[PDB]
C-alpha cells in the first residue's frame, strides 16, 4: 500500500505477489 517492502518487484507491471501495490521498479504493500 506504498510500504517498498513488498520483497518483490515489477519490471513487467506484474509485482507477482498477493496483496501488493506494484509501483515500480518494486511493488509495495
Same mark, same amino acid.
Given at each position: 500500500? +506504498?510500504?517498498?517492502?513488498?520483497?518483490?518487484?515489477?519490471?513487467? +507491471?506484474?509485482?507477482?505477489?498477493?496483496?501488493?501495490?506494484?509501483?515500480?521498479?518494486?511493488?509495495?504493500?
Amino acid at each position: 500500500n +506504498g510500504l517498498p517492502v513488498c520483497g518483490e518487484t515489477c519490471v513487467g +507491471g506484474t509485482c507477482n505477489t498477493p496483496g501488493c501495490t506494484c509501483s515500480w521498479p518494486v511493488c509495495t504493500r
